[PDB]
């Protein structure tokens, strides 16, 4: 998250921290995700496509720090890793960038809701906030584009939704953005998602309800003029999600 503010998991208790274990045993952060039911996390396919083996991953819930345990957290293996059949990628753009992880602990259990671990609601179909609406993004991704390290503390920021028609303009992303994607940015381009924020939540308040509007997917740079963040538009994948949640 470029700019924004530090936070803790109470302020985004559906946020899932996804890591990958290496051959040799080191563990590294991959991507964010969101808890949509006790046994399911939703994320982005591009996070997993090069290493698509479920036994490679570890999922934490209730975690506010990247490399240190948070009191109350829970740790899960990945019982199933479901990537979208029609995934593709450009040089920049990722299509159908959505993934489901079914989570199960060493004891065989799913998430247990607590002050630090909650589900987030999915949107009603084809129902998105109007352009210019302020929504929030959360993650452990870089704080500057040139950084080498990820922040140790979770961050969040606010960005505003951009119309299809505006995001479509050559000097933005032209044809790269489809109707199954949502653009969002800061009016001064000063805050954004970045590397390592992928898979995480874009949350808007919809009919007085906090709703998973988007999933962090792609962008040219970060916090770059005329280059918004691009999000998978969750309201256009409800049959896919409904069906795969077994």
């Amino acid at each position: 998250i470029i700019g924004g503010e530090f936070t803790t998991i109470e302020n985004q208790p559906w946020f899932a921290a996804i890591y990958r274990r290496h051959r040799g045993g080191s563990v590294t952060y991959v991507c964010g995700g969101s808890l949509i039911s006790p046994c399911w996390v939703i994320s982005a396919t591009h996070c997993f496509i090069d290493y698509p083996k479920k036994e490679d991953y570890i999922v934490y819930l209730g975690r506010s720090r990247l490399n240190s345990n948070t009191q109350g957290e829970m740790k899960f293996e990945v019982e199933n890793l479901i990537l979208h059949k029609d995934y593709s990628a450009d040089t920049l753009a990722h299509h159908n960038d959505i993934a489901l992880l079914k989570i199960r602990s060493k004891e065989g259990r799913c998430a247990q809701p607590s002050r630090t671990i909650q589900t987030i609601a999915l949107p009603s179909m084809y129902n998105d906030p109007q352009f210019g609406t302020s929504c929030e993004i959360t993650g452990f991704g870089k704080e500057q584009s040139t950084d080498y390290l990820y922040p140790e503390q979770l961050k969040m920021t606010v960005v505003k939704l951009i119309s299809h028609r505006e995001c479509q303009q050559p000097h933005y992303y032209g044809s790269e953005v489809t109707t199954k994607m949502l653009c969002a940015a800061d009016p001064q381009w000063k805050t954004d998602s970045c590397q390592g924020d992928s898979g995480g939540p874009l949350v808007c308040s919809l009919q007085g309800r906090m709703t998973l509007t988007g999933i962090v997917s792609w962008g040219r740079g970060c916090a770059l003029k005329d280059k918004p963040g691009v999000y998978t538009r969750v309201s256009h994948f409800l049959p896919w999600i409904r069906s795969h949640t077994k």
Binding site: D50, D97, C194, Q195, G196, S198, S217, G229
Partner: peptide, 12 residues
């Protein structure tokens, strides 16, 4: 590789 869409990719 320095940005979003290539997280966890072998070529990065």
């Amino acid at each position: 590789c320095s940005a979003r869409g290539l997280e966890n990719h072998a070529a990065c």
